[PDB]
Amino acid sequence: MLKIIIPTTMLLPMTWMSKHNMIWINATVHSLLISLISLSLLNQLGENSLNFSLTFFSDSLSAPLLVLTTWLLPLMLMASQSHLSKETTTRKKLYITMLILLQLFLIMTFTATELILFYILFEATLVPTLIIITRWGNQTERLNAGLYFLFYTLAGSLPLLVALVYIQNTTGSLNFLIIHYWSHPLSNSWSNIFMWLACIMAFMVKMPLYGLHLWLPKAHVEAPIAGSMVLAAVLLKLGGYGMMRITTILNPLTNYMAYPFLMLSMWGMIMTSSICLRQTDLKSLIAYSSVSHMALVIVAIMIQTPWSFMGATALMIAHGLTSSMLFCLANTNYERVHSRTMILARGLQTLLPLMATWWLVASLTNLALPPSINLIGELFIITASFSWSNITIILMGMNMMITALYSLYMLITTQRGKYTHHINNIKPSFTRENALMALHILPLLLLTLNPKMILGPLY
Amino acid sequence: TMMSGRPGRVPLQFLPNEARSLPPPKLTDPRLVYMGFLGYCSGLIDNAIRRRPVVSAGLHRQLLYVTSFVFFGYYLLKRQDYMYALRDHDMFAYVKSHPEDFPEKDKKTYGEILEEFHPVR
Amino acid sequence: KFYIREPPHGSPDWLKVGLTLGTSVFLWIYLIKQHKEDVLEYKRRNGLE
Amino acid sequence: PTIRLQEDPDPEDENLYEKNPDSHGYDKDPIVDLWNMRVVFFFGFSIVLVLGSTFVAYLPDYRMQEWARREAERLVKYREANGLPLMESNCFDPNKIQLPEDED
Amino acid sequence: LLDLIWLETILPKTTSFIQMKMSIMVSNQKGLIKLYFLSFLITIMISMTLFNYHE
Amino acid sequence: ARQWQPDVEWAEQFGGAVMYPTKETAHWKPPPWNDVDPPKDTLVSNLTLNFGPQ
Amino acid sequence: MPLVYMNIIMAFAIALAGLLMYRSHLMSSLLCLEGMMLSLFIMSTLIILNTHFTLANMMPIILLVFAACEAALGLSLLVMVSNTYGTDYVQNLNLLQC
Amino acid sequence: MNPIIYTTLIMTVMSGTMLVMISSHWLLIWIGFEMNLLAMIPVLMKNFNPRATEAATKYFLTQATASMMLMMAIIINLLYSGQWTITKMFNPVAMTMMTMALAMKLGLSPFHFWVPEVTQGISLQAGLLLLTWQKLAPLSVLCQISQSINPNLMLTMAMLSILIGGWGGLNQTQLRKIMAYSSIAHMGWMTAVLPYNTTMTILNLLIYITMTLAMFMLLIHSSATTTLSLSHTWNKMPVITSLMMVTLLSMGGLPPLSGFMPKWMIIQEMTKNESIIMPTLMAMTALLNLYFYMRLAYSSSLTMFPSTNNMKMKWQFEHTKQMKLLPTMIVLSTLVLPMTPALSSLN
Amino acid sequence: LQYGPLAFVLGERTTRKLTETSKVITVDGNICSGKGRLAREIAEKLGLRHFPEAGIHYADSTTGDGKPLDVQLSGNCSLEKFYDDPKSNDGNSYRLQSWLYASRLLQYADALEHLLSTGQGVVLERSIYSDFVFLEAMYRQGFIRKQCVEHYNEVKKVTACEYLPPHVVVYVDVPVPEIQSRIQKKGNPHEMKITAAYLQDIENAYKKTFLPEMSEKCEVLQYSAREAEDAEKVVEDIEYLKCDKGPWPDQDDRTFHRLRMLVQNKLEVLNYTTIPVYLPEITIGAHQSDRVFQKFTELPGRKYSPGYNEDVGDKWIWLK
Ligand SMILES: CCCCCCCCCCCCCCCCCC(=O)OC[C@H](COP(=O)([O-])OCC(O)COP(=O)([O-])OC[C@@H](COC(=O)CCCCCCCCCCCCCCCCC)OC(=O)CCCCCCCCCCCCCCCCC)OC(=O)CCCCCCCCCCCCCCCCC
Ligand SMILES: CCCCCCCCCCCCCCCCC[C@@H](O)O[C@H](CO[C@H](O)CCCCCCCCCCCCCCC)COP(=O)(O)OCC[N+](C)(C)C
Ligand SMILES: CCCCCCCCCCCCCCCCC[C@@H](O)O[C@H](CO[C@H](O)CCCCCCCCCCCCCCC)COP(=O)(O)OCC[N+](C)(C)C
Ligand SMILES: CCCCCCCCCCCCCCCCC[C@@H](O)O[C@H](CO[C@H](O)CCCCCCCCCCCCCCC)COP(=O)(O)OCC[N+](C)(C)C
Ligand SMILES: CCCCCCCC/C=C\CCCCCCCC(=O)O[C@H](COC(=O)CCCCCCC/C=C/CCCCCCCC)COP(=O)(O)OCCN
Ligand SMILES: Nc1ncnc2c1ncn2[C@@H]1O[C@H](COP(=O)(O)OP(=O)(O)O)[C@@H](O)[C@H]1O
């Protein structure tokens, strides 16, 4: 699959040799071409993976993630080129380089065939993101946000490295195929309990689990728009991919281990969905929405049923798209009014109608309206949980009610009512913003047309 | 430690005579290409630090950087391959000379081995 | 223009350019010859060709 | 000086619609702006979106699901034509399985 | 109560406080070699009677 | 509108003798810009000798 | 092991402790260092004399030579410290505290 | 100092280190250490001031005491076995004495106190020399006798060094003290794997020396010795600060950078043994070093600090003498992880 | 071969090019004195090199093309605005004072480099040793604050201690009424606003501090207004001096090697001028710093090194 990896490494010097006023055009065009190329990975087999070489492979869980990454890069390029207009050409090329390196690391991450290479790229993704946040953020809290983001990740991921090298020393290999075919049960031991914790906690922190989720509001609120897009769309799904890969070795230990994580995920689902009801900041509301959805994905991965895994894959894809669109929609208003307070700019449907319908469709997909892929994934997870325990429906049911509540609350607060009288600098929506919204939203509907492409290997 | 003392080893050779019975790394070896890339990056950083046009300032010195890195990398790769070949040779010889420590166990089929089943529910 | 004429010449320092290119060419030729000799020696030892 | 710095004042926002009433919000130069709009629309909506969706809709059935249906039809036909249970609870033939001789 | 206070208190704020306290304790030395070499003597005595006795 | 960048008040917290000023190290002073402390004007004490009369 | 070996090793330990403990004057610490050289010389000579190793009879000479090198180094440093402060007190050597 | 005398002193330092490395006799190794110290003392005092005199005196006292202990260990080993060859160290008391002597020569905790003071009191060139070249000989001797080394004592000192370097580095505003504390932590990382595999020790040594050379050469290029003096560099040399930030990230140990490779190999080698807890603690403690590296990166490259008016005059002048191999050290300090298997040419 | 350790180990010494006529000379006088013409006459009679007094754009003349740059890109201060509004709250007074001190330090380094490289002597129209008189004049008149004086003193303490004082100190003494009359006869509108107390403070500083301090280490030759015109007398007075009291007779080849390594590398000379002391008058915010620095690199021959700027006519770049 070097036919996708090498064009990105070629995006690098093409950007660094493009003339000063053609960087955005070249980057967008060739990133769109690269996404078109990567779209060919969706032709998956039904029994085994696509083993390209000794180091790279692809199944139907990683192909939609790769397509999502390659599609997200041009969207971030379009969203970034507005707030970087006054920026010097060299640092604009540096920003584009950061985005390209992030894409390359993500692309190699989803297809690395042994656990150590996956770990190396999984953690290499931290450097471009940190540089983006702490160099191109706007406020003074970006430094502390970057510190939280870095150290939460590393604290949970270093024990993963120790566990991985221990596992290879004991079993002889870390290639995923060999690990799956030669898998053996884990005994009920303290050593095994701590090896389970070391294997699981890094991905819990990345999801994030409700407990260790504090870094996420700081990182997503202080980041520039492209940073927020990549954090919400792809970087949260690294933990889900890692769990769905590493879990095969962990069983049968997971049955008595997953209890605290399941309880944390469900109750924190309720808690973080309730937090969105009293959020005075829009970006923080979207961030806590992401936390609750990813808690649902954690429950799905933990209970380990085929329907669970299909729902988790669908929910990961759907949430990536929806959260990216919501962040872009919020950033449009932010660039209008230079403040993130929700109640500052009100009644925007009167002044920005098409942007108002973009808001409506984003909010509708956020609260899992049928037959969107959001609800497909959520309902599959809910059915799997009901099979796991019939009492889960109460918690699941409560979450659905609060999710619809804060989604429509955000829509009503920002779009309806009467426009604030003092603000007179609300210009008509640009073609760039409307195109960006359309390019987020059209793939969601086209995907609900053909939903088997994002349902994972268990399909 | 482990490889420091070995019989019949010249102290500062860096490339024993027995290493010539191994296939040399190809000149298009990806590791050599990475060494050349490292040389190119060193040349570019040299241009940037000295406040010169990064891509085009000194072509002769950039070429010297690239060829120096490739030249060192070729012998580095040869020595790497030789040491790994020695490791495998010694391990195989030790396995062969100590049969009782590496015995071939009986082959069992999955129809005979009884693995406990853990239901997922 | 420059007030003083920037001791690194406005033309290339032909001596340094000369020996830099010379050592690059020499290194490349030596590496090619070493590779050919290694290939022949390896084929001679192992009974291939 | 009653100040702390020799710092530039914060500049005000530059409205793109002022110098270009039809500005597309891509760049300040109208020509580069128009061409950025055109390339985004053509390579996003025309090439990747429509042609990619068409390519995805006509992907060959490598998932082997019509094949599975045909195989199921053949086995059901054969088994019902011979008075067979149409599916057995043993995934593998018990004869090729050697259970432990005793558990007492 | 939970996010802005207690979840902050337990993992990151406790870590920062403990690391800052340990940094202040370790770094703030008087700069005098008298105390340093007294510490060296204590360390040497401990090593001889602990690690060394158990051969 | 513009991105926030550190000011004098922000930069002066990295200009002390150490990070985390405390009660004990509050009276420490940062070393001289060039690492040359002023010469301590040590009073020289010559030997005073009675040479004679005896 | 003989008892004279105990006495020499105790002399070395006493000199090491005396060096480790600092009072005021630097000079006394250099005295302790030179005493440690003296004890090492005596121990080496006794061991070398007892088992008839002929070729090591020269190493105490080299030990004394490098002992003198250390002594000269310490004296030069003490000269410079006293020139800076007027006394050889170790309390003055505290500029690198901050 | 006369250039001829300075060159002679530097070559005497290097010849003492080489004599330590090429000698099979204990007396000759001791003589190499003594020659190294004798020529090393004036180099610290090349630029004369009270602080340089203090650093020279403290360094001399520490190294002289270490030489005392090393000679005593040699003599005890001779007494209990008439052997002059550097080998298994037949006596355990002599082995403990030798281990503490070499650890105090290296600066391993609890003997770490001298290093921050001596590094701060000397110039950046002498600090570079002290923190790179002066570690080779004690580490070579420790490598040669690692079979008889006691795991309990060496691992205790290594863990103490990592903890103390991480903690002490957090409190520091001066750059030389930060480099000294990072040196102590890296020394602990090097000596933790010493009883298990000396090839990993040599690999960590080479990577650390490359990163340290890059960092000192960057700090010499931009004449900065404090945090705020380095906060000015972006207004004169932005490329230097960007390279410094990447080098700092590499120093922290984050992948895919060169710095990550030594810890990754050491952890793997320790887990080939049982040794599970200690590598975990080592990584969680190296997090502190990463933290204060990031503090430096925030102050120097990822934000823009206020400048002064006189920098406009510096804008018109070039860097007169350019240090060779700065570009090479930066590249080797960042982009060398894919060449990791080449460590097999080290054993 | 650029001068360095290698050129010192083999061959080059500088006491074999000092020919007893070097005699670094600095001429000092109160504003609007005939010191410039006296210095020019002294230089052309003695065969020395004359250094015109360092102004705001002195560094511009030694870099790139000798043409001055914009005030916003170099200096960021004007002398005219100091004469118009010496108490303006933008900090122009002390900013100008510190920029002038840095310019004088650079000029002293250049003069010393020329002296130690060719042996030829130099004549200076002022020095870093006498720049403090304007500082004290501003401070006594309330133009600047005490913190500015402390910052100046720190920079001067860490910078001026590394150089050698001039051999001969020439002072042109012209009383305050006469210099006021000369300013009135000048024609410049801006200067005419100099209060007499300012010139009195400058004169007081020169007589009380500069000359007494320079007396212990230099040859001080005071003159009067009428003695300055006949420069032959001054030159033959300089020819019959005994340079015996300063630190110059105590200088070896190693001290000269150190000083010659210091006088080149102007970045090392200017190192301690930009110490991180945050005075509001001279501290520049991040945004303005970035903007002005970006503007500086947009200049015709300032983006790259002095040999690699294509847009000023440098060819063969790819082969350098
Ligand atoms: C994994 C896949 C591959 C990835 C490998 C890693 C990345 C690539 C290699 C990296 C090293 C290579 C270059 C390093 C030296 C360059 C330094 C530099 O500044 O460049 C300026 C230079 C432009 O300057 P200029 O033109 O001379 O004039 C403008 C002035 O110089 C303007 O001068 P200025 O003074 O105004 O500049 C000021 C600016 C200058 O500051 C900088 O430019 C930053 C310098 C980069 C640091 C590099 C450190 C070492 C590399 C480590 C990389 C880490 C990767 C791992 C991921 C973590 C990311 C950190 O500083 C700032 O403004 C502050 C911004 C702070 C941001 C902090 C982030 C910085 C670190 C990020 C590094 C990430 C990699 C960047 C790679 C490219 C960067 C140029 O850039 C280039 O032109 C070179 C780009 C590459 C050239 C390749 C072209 C070859 C031919 C093309 C065709 C290809 C083959 C053809 C055949 C096909 C058949 C047809
Ligand atoms: C903020 C969010 C953080 C993330 C939260 C992650 C939660 C991780 C918790 C892991 C759950 C399982 C760990 C222990 C397994 C068994 C539970 C315990 O009760 O053991 C009992 C045993 O009784 C006692 O509880 C033994 C453990 C006593 C010590 C544990 C106390 C720890 C206090 C909790 C601290 C909070 C955790 C967070 C730390 C920062 C069971 O009896 P037994 O069947 O015989 O033993 C089964 C295990 N065997 C078979 C291997 C032996
Ligand atoms: C960032 C990487 C840092 C690299 C450091 C500098 C890189 C260049 C190294 C300079 C090359 C010349 C050194 C030696 C050449 C000829 C001398 C020859 O005799 O050396 C022999 C063999 O050569 C050297 O031993 C090996 C040098 C190889 C260095 C490169 C390995 C780098 C580690 C992996 C990182 C990847 C780097 C990729 C290139 C940048 C010594 O054999 P031996 O007497 O028995 O060893 C005694 C000590 N032992 C046994 C304990 C080892
Ligand atoms: C502004 C005006 C609005 C109102 C006017 C609207 C105009 C008319 C629109 C109304 C018509 C409704 C459509 C009716 C459905 C017909 C389409 C259907 O037949 O196609 C589906 C097929 O859907 C496609 O598969 C959709 C492709 C999915 C999108 C591809 C992704 C594009 C790349 C963008 C990046 C996305 C990244 C996220 C991760 C993937 C059926 O699936 P399938 O039965 O099997 O295929 C049939 C062909 N076979 C039989 C040969 C197999
Ligand atoms: C955002 C913050 C998150 C931080 C989470 C970090 C902690 C993750 C959980 C523990 C990680 C450390 C596990 C160690 C690596 C696993 C390797 C392993 O399992 O192998 C075991 C080794 O098991 C161990 O040694 C485990 C020792 C644990 C010591 C480290 C203490 C860490 C703190 C413990 C409690 C906290 C952990 C949970 C906290 C969750 C986060 C709140 C078997 O080795 P043997 O010695 O050969 O035994 C069998 C042969 N006789
Ligand atoms: N350190 C300083 N501070 C303020 N003004 C100064 C300083 N140095 C020189 N000047 C001004 O520069 C101008 C020229 O000085 P001067 O030599 O007296 O005139 P001329 O060149 O005609 O002889 C004068 O107006 C003087 O005030």
Coordinates of N, CA, C and O in Angstrom, one line a residue, chain A residues 408-444:
Chain A
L408 N -30.5 19.8 20.6 CA -31.5 20.8 20.3 C -31.3 22.1 21.1 O -31.7 23.2 20.6
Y409 N -30.8 22.0 22.3 CA -30.6 23.2 23.1 C -29.5 24.1 22.4 O -29.7 25.3 22.3
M410 N -28.4 23.5 22.0 CA -27.4 24.2 21.2 C -27.9 24.8 20.0 O -27.7 26.0 19.7
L411 N -28.7 24.0 19.2 CA -29.3 24.6 18.0 C -30.2 25.8 18.2 O -30.1 26.8 17.6
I412 N -31.1 25.6 19.2 CA -32.0 26.7 19.5 C -31.3 27.9 20.0 O -31.6 29.1 19.7
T413 N -30.3 27.7 20.9 CA -29.6 28.9 21.5 C -28.8 29.6 20.4 O -28.9 30.9 20.4
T414 N -28.1 28.9 19.6 CA -27.3 29.7 18.6 C -28.1 30.2 17.4 O -27.8 31.3 17.0
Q415 N -29.1 29.5 17.0 CA -29.7 29.8 15.7 C -31.0 30.6 15.8 O -31.4 31.3 14.9
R416 N -31.8 30.3 16.9 CA -33.1 30.9 17.0 C -33.2 32.0 18.0 O -32.2 32.4 18.6
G417 N -34.4 32.6 18.2 CA -34.5 33.8 19.0 C -34.4 35.0 18.1 O -34.6 35.0 16.9
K418 N -33.9 36.1 18.7 CA -33.6 37.3 18.0 C -32.1 37.6 18.1 O -31.5 37.4 19.1
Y419 N -31.6 38.2 17.0 CA -30.2 38.5 16.8 C -29.9 39.6 17.8 O -30.6 40.5 18.1
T420 N -28.7 39.4 18.4 CA -28.2 40.4 19.4 C -28.1 41.7 18.6 O -27.5 41.8 17.5
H421 N -28.6 42.8 19.2 CA -28.6 44.1 18.5 C -27.2 44.8 18.2 O -27.0 45.3 17.1
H422 N -26.3 44.7 19.2 CA -25.0 45.3 19.0 C -24.1 44.8 17.9 O -23.4 45.6 17.2
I423 N -24.1 43.5 17.6 CA -23.2 42.9 16.6 C -23.7 43.2 15.2 O -24.7 42.7 14.8
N424 N -22.9 43.9 14.4 CA -23.2 44.3 13.1 C -22.1 43.8 12.1 O -22.1 44.3 10.9
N425 N -21.2 43.0 12.5 CA -20.1 42.5 11.6 C -20.3 41.1 11.1 O -19.4 40.4 10.9
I426 N -21.6 40.6 11.1 CA -21.9 39.3 10.6 C -22.1 39.4 9.1 O -23.1 39.8 8.6
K427 N -21.0 39.0 8.4 CA -21.0 39.0 6.9 C -21.7 37.8 6.4 O -21.7 36.7 7.1
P428 N -22.1 37.8 5.1 CA -22.7 36.6 4.5 C -21.7 35.5 4.4 O -20.5 35.7 4.3
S429 N -22.2 34.2 4.6 CA -21.4 33.1 4.5 C -20.6 32.9 3.2 O -21.2 33.1 2.1
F430 N -19.4 32.6 3.3 CA -18.5 32.5 2.1 C -18.8 31.1 1.4 O -19.4 30.2 2.0
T431 N -18.4 31.0 0.2 CA -18.5 29.8 -0.6 C -17.6 28.7 0.0 O -18.0 27.5 0.0
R432 N -16.5 29.1 0.6 CA -15.6 28.1 1.2 C -16.2 27.4 2.4 O -16.2 26.2 2.5
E433 N -16.9 28.2 3.3 CA -17.5 27.6 4.4 C -18.7 26.7 4.1 O -18.8 25.6 4.6
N434 N -19.5 27.1 3.1 CA -20.6 26.2 2.7 C -20.1 25.0 2.0 O -20.7 23.9 2.2
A435 N -19.1 25.1 1.2 CA -18.5 23.9 0.6 C -17.9 22.9 1.6 O -18.1 21.7 1.5
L436 N -17.3 23.5 2.7 CA -16.7 22.7 3.8 C -17.8 21.9 4.5 O -17.7 20.7 4.8
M437 N -19.0 22.6 4.8 CA -20.1 21.9 5.4 C -20.7 20.9 4.5 O -21.0 19.8 5.0
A438 N -20.8 21.1 3.3 CA -21.4 20.1 2.3 C -20.4 18.9 2.2 O -20.9 17.8 2.2
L439 N -19.1 19.1 2.2 CA -18.2 18.0 2.1 C -18.1 17.2 3.4 O -17.7 16.1 3.4
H440 N -18.4 17.8 4.6 CA -18.7 17.0 5.8 C -20.0 16.2 5.6 O -20.0 14.9 5.9
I441 N -21.1 16.8 5.2 CA -22.4 16.2 5.4 C -22.8 15.2 4.3 O -23.5 14.2 4.6
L442 N -22.3 15.4 3.1 CA -22.7 14.5 2.0 C -22.2 13.1 2.2 O -23.0 12.1 2.0
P443 N -21.0 12.9 2.6 CA -20.5 11.5 2.9 C -21.3 10.7 3.9 O -21.5 9.5 3.8
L444 N -21.9 11.4 5.0 CA -22.7 10.7 6.0 C -23.9 10.1 5.3 O -24.2 8.9 5.6

